[PDB]
Design a protein around this ligand. Sequence first.
Ligand SMILES: *[C@@H]1O[C@H](CO)[C@@H](O[C@@H]2O[C@H](CO)[C@@H](O[C@H]3O[C@H](CO)[C@@H](O[C@@H]4O[C@H](CO)[C@@H](O[C@@H]5O[C@H](CO)[C@@H](O[C@H]6O[C@H](CO)[C@@H](O)[C@H](O)[C@@H]6O)[C@H](O)[C@@H]5O)[C@H](O)[C@@H]4O)[C@H](O)[C@@H]3O)[C@H](O)[C@H]2NC(C)=O)[C@H](O)[C@H]1NC(C)=O
Ligand SMILES: *[C@@H]1O[C@H](CO)[C@@H](O[C@@H]2O[C@H](CO)[C@@H](O[C@H]3O[C@H](CO[C@@H]4O[C@H](CO)[C@@H](O)[C@H](O)[C@@H]4O)[C@@H](O[C@@H]4O[C@H](CO)[C@@H](O)[C@H](O)[C@@H]4O)[C@H](O)[C@@H]3O)[C@H](O)[C@H]2NC(C)=O)[C@H](O)[C@H]1NC(C)=O
Ligand SMILES: *[C@@H]1O[C@H](CO)[C@@H](O[C@@H]2O[C@H](CO)[C@@H](O)[C@H](O)[C@H]2NC(C)=O)[C@H](O)[C@H]1NC(C)=O
Ligand SMILES: [Fe+3]
Ligand SMILES: [Zn+2]
Ligand SMILES: [Zn+2]
Length: 341
Amino acid sequence: YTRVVWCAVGPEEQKKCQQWSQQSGQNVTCATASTTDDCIVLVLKGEADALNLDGGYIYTAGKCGLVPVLAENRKSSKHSSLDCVLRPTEGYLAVAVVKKANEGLTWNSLKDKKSCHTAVDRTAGWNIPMGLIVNQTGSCAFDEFFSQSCAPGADPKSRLCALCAGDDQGLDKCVPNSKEKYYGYTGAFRCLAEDVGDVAFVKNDTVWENTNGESTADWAKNLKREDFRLLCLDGTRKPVTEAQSCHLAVAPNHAVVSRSDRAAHVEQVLLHQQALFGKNGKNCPDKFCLFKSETKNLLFNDNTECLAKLGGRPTYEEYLGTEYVTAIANLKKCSLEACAF
Ligand SMILES: *[C@@H]1O[C@H](CO)[C@@H](O[C@@H]2O[C@H](CO)[C@@H](O[C@H]3O[C@H](CO)[C@@H](O[C@@H]4O[C@H](CO)[C@@H](O[C@@H]5O[C@H](CO)[C@@H](O[C@H]6O[C@H](CO)[C@@H](O)[C@H](O)[C@@H]6O)[C@H](O)[C@@H]5O)[C@H](O)[C@@H]4O)[C@H](O)[C@@H]3O)[C@H](O)[C@H]2NC(C)=O)[C@H](O)[C@H]1NC(C)=O
Ligand SMILES: *[C@@H]1O[C@H](CO)[C@@H](O[C@@H]2O[C@H](CO)[C@@H](O[C@H]3O[C@H](CO[C@@H]4O[C@H](CO)[C@@H](O)[C@H](O)[C@@H]4O)[C@@H](O[C@@H]4O[C@H](CO)[C@@H](O)[C@H](O)[C@@H]4O)[C@H](O)[C@@H]3O)[C@H](O)[C@H]2NC(C)=O)[C@H](O)[C@H]1NC(C)=O
Ligand SMILES: *[C@@H]1O[C@H](CO)[C@@H](O[C@@H]2O[C@H](CO)[C@@H](O)[C@H](O)[C@H]2NC(C)=O)[C@H](O)[C@H]1NC(C)=O
Ligand SMILES: [Fe+3]
Ligand SMILES: [Zn+2]
Ligand SMILES: [Zn+2]
């Protein structure tokens, strides 16, 4: 038992982590890096213990020997009497979203159009859709498929960063942290919402949490579901209500990882942390709520009900599942057995 050092990605996560730190009596402390990759490195080194990660990063981290510990769990309909911490995770739907007004734009006419990605190496924003495109075009030149994009994490001076905007001042353009205006699920959807891009690769949930009054953000308060369409892989367009029948894939939930030798320890502390600041926790919303950051998805997704135990002590390949791991492998041949660091 003891203190857990969390790794925050960028200045906004840092500010929230510090709040969490103060409220916890320093039972959790904070380290900060500029990218998710740097955070993986801090954990490897032992300078940080844990962070929450999208599936695409669970993959990077796993080659380097880090393990899944607890997974994000959101509101469910199947598997009903079980307590949240013990309910199995559902996964989320990776979808491609466009404006209704942009008529005649289908999966089969995406070439040379403008795109919005959560960030390079992420599941819904990059791995799935780009894996799909490489496989469909028989080419590895996925950097030449779209005319312009905002793909946080690519080369700032490449076309994959042409549509990114940086921070309030124009700095940090295309950085894969929340300082970049078009970063993450929310940033990518905003990129489409403001007609900077033609299509956004996000998840089912993002469309719903940022339309019809669900978000009071300047850019989203007037957004309406009917104004959006999902691009299905059979060439059709469907309303956002039909995501169960019109998605690119189902993604494994974001999860907390740590070095294997710290797993038990990290797990113990966080379960107690969530009993205090989680969905129905003792001090939320009284003093501090771990799963809220006003639609910004800082440290955790805002729609998380709880962090769930992984039943069955998964390796990272089992957590991701065989379907998703094959996809990432085949796509990374474009740009076997080794840790990136
Ligand atoms: C896309 O992403 C979005 C965003 O994440 C998802 O939208 C969210 O999804 C959740 C659920 O998935 C939404 O529901 C939330 O609000 C509920 C309303 O209070 C909360 O409680 C639930 O209510 C459900 C019904 O609304 C319950 O389900 C059942 O309802 C049946 C009614 O037909 C009922 O049937 C009985 O009673 C009937 C009377 O009408 C009889 O006719 C029948 O005979 C039968 O006896 C069942 O008993 C049962 O109640 C459910 O059990 C819950 O209690 C709850 O808090 C929940 O979270 C959420 O609002 C929504 N978010 C937003 C902002 O839209 C969406 O799901 C995603 N879609 C995909 C494809 O993944
Ligand atoms: C890009 O193209 C790539 C090349 O095609 C894709 O990589 C391919 O991905 C495929 C699907 O993920 C893999 O094919 C699978 O083929 C068999 C079918 O899956 C099985 O289904 C049974 C249910 O009946 C399950 O029980 C079982 O677990 C499998 O999931 C699999 O063969 C099986 O082998 C067992 C014995 O081990 C046998 O008894 C079963 O009958 C069954 O036939 C096989 O293992 C695969 O799962 C391809 O392997 C994979 N190809 C390559 C070259 O990597 C890639 O996904 C494409 N990208 C996208 C985005 O789609
Ligand atoms: C610091 O962590 C410890 C361990 O969970 C907490 O102190 C515990 O308080 C609980 C009551 O919730 C007792 O049952 C345990 O005996 C205590 N453990 C120890 C090791 O003393 C405490 O809640 C945490 N403090 C903060 C700020 O979260
Ligand atoms: Fe994701
Ligand atoms: Zn499906
Ligand atoms: Zn196993």
